[PDB]
Write an enzyme that holds these catalytic residues in place. Structure first.
Site: not given
Ligand SMILES: [Cl-]
Ligand SMILES: [Cl-]
Ligand SMILES: [Cl-]
Ligand SMILES: [Cl-]
Ligand SMILES: [Cl-]
Ligand SMILES: [Cl-]
Lengths: 243, 248, 242, 248, 249, 249
Positions: D114, D134
């Site tokens: 990210e 996640e």
């Protein structure tokens, strides 16, 4: 040695633009000093930051001999520095309160427009006159101003260069309170210092970010901030009498 | 007056183009012919070497709004076509390189006032009667009365004025932010206008663009844009000359 | 029940009723307000008016409740406040808040989502909740500046300053001040005379103008204008000149 | 002393600053110490006279994501504080005057990936395993996995990748727009990077600003901004020299 | 004709399509000021016409290699700004047109020229098309939307990569990124796609175009509201009503 | 209403998923008013149940061919507007739902029906799916987001092209454009993807969905600020804490 001083009054850091012989007009040296002192003020354990000028005047605006020396490149570089300070004022965790008096104009007033709160002494002369010398704005005089006074007043003030008195500036929304005495300004500032730090910080963030989104999104954000306040010890203590 | 026959006149006063809505027998109410004339005269004013454009009405009134016999003739298609024409003039006012200043007096209502809301600056004679009364006849807005108005006066006042159709006097409109200056004499309006004509053209153009586009972006982006306009002003001869007293 | 619903001509009248606690908003009041607001929407009234019972509109969120929150229950409370505020803003009917006496914090903030605010002359108006560590009850940070501007919003919210009715009017936080209840009802009744669809489209364009650029908003306003010419009430209102 | 134990290294490779996430025994997973080191090294890279900044991992892997023991220790306050730090480094990447280029390989996942989504360019080795897994452990995103990801791959793919946690190979990631080039050899990545180094600095900086701010405004505003930047490039000596072959 | 003046952009007609042809092949149809002024002009004429779509292409093998490099090299900041305002203005007219605008790319289709095509509604590419924005190499950020329109077509990451690297794409690669909508190996097949668009009711294509454009300037709910209003107004259009008439009752 | 009676929209339960089935196969599950009203009701029911996701599909071979064309043909502007407000409202409830919504496309998946699916969080397609927005052929701009949501999935260029041309895509083509997220040759494989989503904590999926949706209404920094706040609030959720408990201490 320095064109901006930093001082302390109670829980307030006090930043003072200090070039009175030139009506506290903003040159490159003053800008560099303002950025440095503003950093110091943010790291101190004060709760608010107050910005004012030394002597009779807040600031007459950008230094005109400096303006007259610019070409496009050096002009752009000046404005990036203005923008950067204005942005640090807006992003600060601490409320920033401008205390306007005498001449409060142009680039200087425009930096005060990024502050959270503007208080004016009764003798203040307020306006953005720099269109007369061909300048659009020093630091938000076109793009922050209208959020304070509306679309129509912003254009009028920026195009005409009209000078306002303190009551006229208040009635437009450009100033939040007028006082005839410095002690009364400090009383308003001290009252703000009583509020929990995290609370003021979140109020500030939500207000700022309301201009970058639609309502629902903004309401969602305000709710999340509200929720995070309940992790803060100062907030919980402020509520404890009713627990 | 036999020689006053077109529905919008164009005149000149020094560095100002002066556009005059001229249908006084109907309180300068806006019909389709007027709209077409206004678009034409606005183009002429833009091409002229004037520095600002001023819009007003002939006689005692600015404009009482859209012509109601025209409104009553509409179906959805012709209504949409009318509003596209209003939108287009409004947009040309906002995108103009020149500042546009509306000089309000007597009746300044509805569609006409709403066009004036797209102008940069609104000056009102003391006798002005200002409002958006068209909700009474079932109309939402003529030309920005719902989506430009709140940028002038705020969300709350916008809704209140549009819903209630309340008529304001000139001072009341000023206090709301709907008007920028009130004057008891036409000469004083021209003084304000002439002072605007002294400022460098490019400067006023950039001020206008940045203000307009501030409503379409976040602050940082807007600040970045203001800075870029500032920088480009230093390529402009008129700006450079305005600064020359202080050079060196 | 803590919120009453009544009818007054063409107006549904919703009354916050917990005067012994200055009409302070707790959970039960919130649930009642949502229920009464639904009822008011379904009725054949033309506007919805919100006020408080007795001397006061509302002093704000109930402080004992606030003090009982942790982050999860605080979030859950605010979602409920958000939801009622959103229903007020999305309503087909105009919503008009009638402020009097204490008109503060979360209660005032709900009124900030209303279309119109009218204040009795005795009104005490403000957002004092920063004093007890709260940012806002319901738009006190993100709606308020659309009413009064960026600078006044920060100043009111940070300082918690209490305004009188004229001061609130001059900032744009209130639309009209009246020294008599009858004069408020005259304003309300005048709004009831306008065609329903017209008011609904005015409200819809104003509210969405904050979520787009001008040209888009002008396009939208034009489309609404055009759709009004499919509405019988509008056509009737124009018929004298047809 | 301090040298033996830094979790992020900085190196130099021609005109590129090279920042290396170095905690290979934990698959270069991001903890607080690593975050603090990354912020420091990123500053150093910005001040150096290099032209681009490249970010990668030590050894086989770029990064497996946020350290899971750290995640498991959080309460709401410390979780917020962590994300503010992630946000801040992501933001410095996006606001940097220099292009930032992420070189993905092996595990390139979650919070680490990210961060790379804020970079200007992502290049992937052919062995890369890419995804945002996640959500499986109850996390929405490490650093833009919900709000930056859709600007790369679209609304649908963003939701699908984030909700499902689907693992991607390098070609699949490229076809979605999550990665810009796939190479089977490190040298080929450096050739792409070196080519970017040949472009004038100011030009790349302006490209980057215009792209980033295009997500905060409408088209016309953005076009206005692009034009202003284009104009300011003609004050830059490097740009002028690049054009000089064609002068007259 | 002693006053004969040649034109750098030609206009033609091909059934229900206006056809605008960039014509400076000896310089790879590179865009200079005169070409820009002629393009603006021909585009107005095309809008006036009773045609249903506007098609833009280049004369000969190439669409356009980009902005004229000698012109770029003559600029200072003022004249550069003035050039970009003209580019912006033509790009905006393409985006605000009532008619669909379709770019037909072939050979060199790059830089400023390609960037104008990015404002078009539809891009079709001949198989030989060489597509990219190489101008960063000579210090230029973008000709006309190469930074701010491009990412709406291909995504944030691809946009930066293409603009920074100056990478040249082939026609299939450009299609897969979303930069081009269809690839064809001959001109007749491009006309068949264009003709299919001409079959749709005008008002419908117009409303589709407006809603797509404005979707980038607002939140979803607002956009959905606008899409609904447009939908409704289509029922006042004779061409729409006829297209539905098979199913009436 | 009861299990043995046919209805236009059925609701079923499949493990932790609510399953909503458009059921008018004799008309290719084309959407009329009665179907719309039923869909809104069944969608409410699905939201109130203790299921973790909502799945939407069609009965039989097809998902949906689109809006009912006889209904379209009966409209005037008022009744058309009223239809689109109902479409908008169901689309919005899909986007604002706390639960993920997953569309399972097969056979004909077009127009208004496809456009409702475009509001869903995830689209999975059977290999036989025929996907597109063909309604411009009969003068319609869009059923429900085909102009203002579509470009957020596939980009500005592909949106205009698909909507203007009415082109029909196969499943792989739709996947490559970003209009579909996964293609499967077997229904069981779709259910495996769905069941895996059901394993994730509810609050997590809800927050992912909110942030994604609100990323279209704001600038990056603001959206990053929001994502961080959500992240933080997840640490008040029991299901999230449990999911992390293997690694605590
Ligand atoms: Cl100044
Ligand atoms: Cl009117
Ligand atoms: Cl409160
Ligand atoms: Cl992670
Ligand atoms: Cl070029
Ligand atoms: Cl359909």
């Amino acid at each position: 040695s320095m064109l901006v001083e930093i001082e302390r009054r109670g829980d307030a850091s006090l930043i003072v633009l200090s070039r009175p012989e030139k009506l506290n007009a903003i040159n490159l040296e003053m800008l560099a000093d303002l950025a440095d002192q503003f950093s110091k003020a943010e790291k101190e354990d004060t709760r608010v930051i107050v910005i004012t000028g030394y002597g009779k005047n807040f600031s007459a605006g950008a230094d005109i001999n400096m303006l007259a020396s610019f070409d496009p490149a050096s002009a752009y570089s000046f404005r990036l520095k203005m923008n950067s300070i204005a942005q640090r004022i807006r992003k600060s965790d601490k409320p920033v309160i401008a205390l306007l008096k005498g001449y409060s104009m142009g680039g200087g007033l425009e930096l005060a427009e990024s502050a959270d709160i503007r208080i004016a002494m009764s003798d203040a002369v307020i306006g953005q006159p720099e269109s007369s010398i061909g300048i659009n704005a020093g630091a938000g005089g076109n793009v922050i101003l209208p959020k304070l006074v509306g679309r129509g007043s912003a254009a009028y003030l920026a195009m005409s260069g009209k000078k306002l008195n303190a009551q006229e500036a208040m009635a437009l929304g450009l100033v939040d309170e007028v006082v005839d005495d410095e002690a009364k300004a400090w009383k308003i500032i001290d009252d703000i210092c009583k509020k929990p730090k995290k609370t003021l910080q979140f109020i500030k963030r939500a207000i700022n970010s309301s201009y970058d989104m639609g309502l629902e999104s903004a309401m969602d954000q305000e709710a999340l901030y509200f929720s995070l306040l309940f992790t803060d010890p100062e907030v919980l203590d402020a509520l404890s009498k009713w627990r």
